Amino acid sequence: LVYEIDGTEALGSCLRVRPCSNDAPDLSKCTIQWYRSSSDGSKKELISGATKSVYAPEPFDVGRVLHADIIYDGHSLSLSTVGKIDPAAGLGSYVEALVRKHDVDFNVVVTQMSGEDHTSESIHLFHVGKMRIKLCKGKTVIAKEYYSSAMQLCGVRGGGNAAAQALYWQAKKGVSFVIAFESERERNAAIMLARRFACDCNVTLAGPEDRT
Question: CA of 169: how far to CAs of 32, 72, 149, 153, in Å?
Fold first, then answer.
């Protein structure tokens, strides 16, 4: 019809809703929501906060069909990916190597703090450890939090084009960050590693409203 989903359907890539015609309303005037098919494929699960024309798959999306619903000028259109999101080749093996290191860190740039733009490009270290995550700038700790049921961590949902390289981390209520990695692979490794370490602490770490 009037819009379509475009993009490589793989972890590491970005998907976007794009107009098929110049007569299609501007995306800024549209209301968009993304969903993932459930694990048993029976229904679609709203990806909370994924309300932009751009959505970058994250690890929970692998093996799932993704969907975008759009309301435009009093009409509606339901779209989906051609198929299931492909995994990132070799990523599983990399994560296994990272597990053996105990605490690993990643160079990151902080782009948001508790919902507010953070313009500084200063490189931070994002530490993903057996029991805690911490974010540091040089010698100073910005945030440190042990895995907890309150914590959230997922691929970013509201900031496309950079999106495939960034994650959202809510350390605790009112304390959150959007953090950008040097590559998509590094971003996804950090998400998977944090989730593995959290799981070993009997914590199920996910994005807001995720079905696990």
Answer: 23, 31, 13, 5
